[PDB]
Design a protein around this motif. Structure first.
Motif, mmCIF file in Angstrom:
data_model
loop_
_atom_site.group_PDB
_atom_site.id
_atom_site.type_symbol
_atom_site.label_atom_id
_atom_site.label_comp_id
_atom_site.label_asym_id
_atom_site.label_seq_id
_atom_site.Cartn_x
_atom_site.Cartn_y
_atom_site.Cartn_z
ATOM 1 N N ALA A 202 117.064 76.461 50.015
ATOM 2 C CA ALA A 202 115.978 77.255 50.652
ATOM 3 C C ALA A 202 115.893 78.626 49.995
ATOM 4 N N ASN A 203 114.980 78.782 49.044
ATOM 5 C CA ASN A 203 114.839 80.063 48.365
ATOM 6 C C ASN A 203 114.325 81.137 49.312
ATOM 7 N N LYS A 204 114.975 82.297 49.278
ATOM 8 C CA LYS A 204 114.597 83.414 50.131
ATOM 9 C C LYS A 204 113.663 84.394 49.403
ATOM 10 N N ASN A 205 113.089 83.934 48.301
ATOM 11 C CA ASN A 205 112.154 84.756 47.554
ATOM 12 C C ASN A 205 111.061 83.840 47.067
ATOM 13 N N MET A 206 110.781 82.827 47.875
ATOM 14 C CA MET A 206 109.725 81.886 47.567
ATOM 15 C C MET A 206 108.435 82.617 47.927
ATOM 16 N N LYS A 207 107.395 82.392 47.138
ATOM 17 C CA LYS A 207 106.096 83.025 47.339
ATOM 18 C C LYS A 207 105.403 82.438 48.573
ATOM 19 N N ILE A 208 105.081 83.275 49.550
ATOM 20 C CA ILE A 208 104.441 82.763 50.755
ATOM 21 C C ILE A 208 103.101 83.402 51.084
ATOM 22 N N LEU A 209 102.179 82.556 51.530
ATOM 23 C CA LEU A 209 100.861 83.007 51.930
ATOM 24 C C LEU A 209 100.775 82.870 53.446
ATOM 25 N N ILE A 210 100.427 83.969 54.105
ATOM 26 C CA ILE A 210 100.282 83.993 55.552
ATOM 27 C C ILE A 210 98.781 84.030 55.805
ATOM 28 N N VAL A 211 98.271 83.025 56.509
ATOM 29 C CA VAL A 211 96.841 82.930 56.797
ATOM 30 C C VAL A 211 96.575 83.057 58.297
ATOM 31 N N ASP A 212 95.706 83.999 58.672
ATOM 32 C CA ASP A 212 95.328 84.221 60.074
ATOM 33 C C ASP A 212 94.147 85.204 60.108
ATOM 34 N N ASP A 213 93.153 84.956 60.956
ATOM 35 C CA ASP A 213 92.021 85.879 61.026
ATOM 36 C C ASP A 213 92.425 87.215 61.679
ATOM 37 N N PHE A 214 93.501 87.193 62.463
ATOM 38 C CA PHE A 214 94.018 88.395 63.132
ATOM 39 C C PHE A 214 95.021 89.137 62.252
ATOM 40 N N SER A 215 94.627 90.309 61.768
ATOM 41 C CA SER A 215 95.492 91.119 60.919
ATOM 42 C C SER A 215 96.851 91.422 61.544
ATOM 43 N N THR A 216 96.861 91.830 62.807
ATOM 44 C CA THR A 216 98.132 92.144 63.434
ATOM 45 C C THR A 216 99.071 90.934 63.427
ATOM 46 N N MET A 217 98.524 89.731 63.585
ATOM 47 C CA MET A 217 99.359 88.528 63.573
ATOM 48 C C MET A 217 99.987 88.283 62.185
ATOM 49 N N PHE B 52 112.858 87.262 53.584
ATOM 50 C CA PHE B 52 111.716 86.793 52.796
ATOM 51 C C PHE B 52 110.750 87.951 52.738
ATOM 52 N N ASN B 53 110.534 88.494 51.554
ATOM 53 C CA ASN B 53 109.624 89.612 51.440
ATOM 54 C C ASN B 53 108.533 89.378 50.412
ATOM 55 N N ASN B 54 108.474 88.157 49.893
ATOM 56 C CA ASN B 54 107.460 87.809 48.909
ATOM 57 C C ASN B 54 106.244 87.192 49.616
ATOM 58 N N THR B 55 105.656 87.947 50.539
ATOM 59 C CA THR B 55 104.498 87.466 51.289
ATOM 60 C C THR B 55 103.198 88.176 50.936
ATOM 61 N N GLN B 56 102.119 87.404 50.912
ATOM 62 C CA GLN B 56 100.791 87.919 50.639
ATOM 63 C C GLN B 56 99.903 87.373 51.769
#
Ligand code: BEF
Ligand SMILES: [Mg+2]
Length: 124
Positions: free
Chosen positions: A1-16, A29-33
């Protein structure tokens, strides 16, 4: 389980997206866009070389369910693990996401505890 895997977070609510980002940071995990709708996520996934997708369901543009079908119906994107996060707690809807190929699910509101739990559950 890589802890620097590239992740995309999708949600219409910015705060979420914001909350999900920090919980992920909390788990190492800090490689989020981000993308605010399935319509903006696709083009990003199309060339971003992401490793993981966390997506909301209810989105005005392109619903999270449709996004996962596009990811799956795409030969270059079909191996992407997808965790669906959403308020839709109805079983009939979870079934629907399962049939569509989602890897995991998690109902809002959730904690870093619960999240890590789901993540580990997913990697297969
Ligand atoms: F907007 Be998701 F359905 F919580
Ligand atoms: Mg939504």
């Amino acid at each position: 389980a890589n802890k620097n895997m590239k992740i995309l977070i999708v949600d219409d609510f910015s705060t979420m997206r914001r909350i999900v980002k920090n919980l992920l940071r909390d788990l190492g995990f800090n490689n989020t866009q981000e993308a605010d709708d399935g319509l903006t996520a696709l083009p990003m996934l199309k060339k971003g070389d992401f490793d993981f997708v966390v997506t909301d369901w209810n989105m005005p543009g392109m619903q999270g369910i449709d996004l996962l079908k596009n990811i799956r119906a795409d030969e270059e994107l079909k191996h992407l693990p997808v965790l669906m996060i959403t308020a839709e707690a109805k079983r009939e809807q979870i079934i629907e996401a399962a049939q569509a190929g989602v890897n995991g699910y998690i109902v809002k509101p959730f904690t870093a505890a619960t999240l890590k739990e789901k993540l580990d559950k997913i990697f297969e």
